[PDB]
Structure formats: C-alpha cells, structure tokens
Design a protein around this ligand. Structure first.
Ligand SMILES: [Cl-]
Ligand code: NA
Length: 129
C-alpha cells in the first residue's frame, strides 16, 4: 500500500509514535517518506547481503528474519515479510524497539541525512490530527 502523507501521520499517531522517545510525529513521517516513499512494499538489498523492508526500511541483519541473512538476528521476532503488510502495526512495533536501542532515529540513515535538523513539523502540517 502507498500511504498518503496525512493518512500515514494519522496511522502513526494512532500507534503511539507521536513523541515516542521524544521524536515528534513529523520525524517519523519524514523518515518514512525518504526511506520508502510511503510504500509498505519497498525492499532494498544491501552490500552485506541484508535487506531493508517496509515503510521504515527495517534491516534483516538485526531486526527480522528473511531466511537469507546468515548469522543475523531477529530482535523484533517477526518474519521480514510481516513488515510489508498494508497494516503498519508490525513495522511500528519494531521501530519502537529500534529507536529505544540507544542511537535514537540515527539508526535511519535517510532520517539522519534528510530530516534531522530540518523543519520536520512541515510533514504533518495541514493534516487533521
Ligand atoms: Cl534520542
Ligand atoms: Na535477521
């Protein structure tokens, strides 16, 4: 599913992401936009053999199992395929685990290079929240 900007914002807010670990809603919508262009079915393979999945491009090296990333962890306890669902619940729950691990949203390269230090509030501006 390809989310609308406001539609995803409302979805993320409902799942408890607004202000989660101090990150305002705008930060999450911004990350999703530049990681996956709001496409739940986005996948991208990395040089180390791992793959990033879903709206938040969560990595199979640590967070989910895709059966093809030798010696990897599954810290979210889920199949990576579950991160591609139209229902963002799995991705949200796993992202909460990732942002809690100590590096905050810096774990998302796109967020660090394109959202951090920017007016992220612009990503939810005009939305009925
Ligand atoms: Cl932080
Ligand atoms: Na894995």
């Amino acid at each position: 599913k390809v989310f609308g900007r406001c539609e995803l914002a409302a979805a993320m807010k409902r799942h408890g992401l607004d202000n989660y670990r101090g990150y305002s809603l705008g930060n999450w919508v911004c990350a999703a936009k530049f990681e996956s262009n709001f496409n739940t079915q986005a996948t991208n393979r990395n040089t180390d053999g791992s793959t990033d999945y879903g709206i938040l491009q969560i990595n199979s090296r640590w967070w989910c199992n895709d059966g093809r990333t030798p010696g990897s962890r599954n810290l979210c306890n889920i199949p990576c395929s579950a991160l591609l669902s139209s229902d963002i619940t799995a991705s949200v729950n796993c992202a909460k685990k990732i942002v809690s691990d100590g590096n905050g949203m810096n774990a998302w390269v796109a967020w660090r290079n394109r959202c951090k230090g920017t007016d992220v509030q612009a990503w939810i501006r005009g939305c009925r929240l």
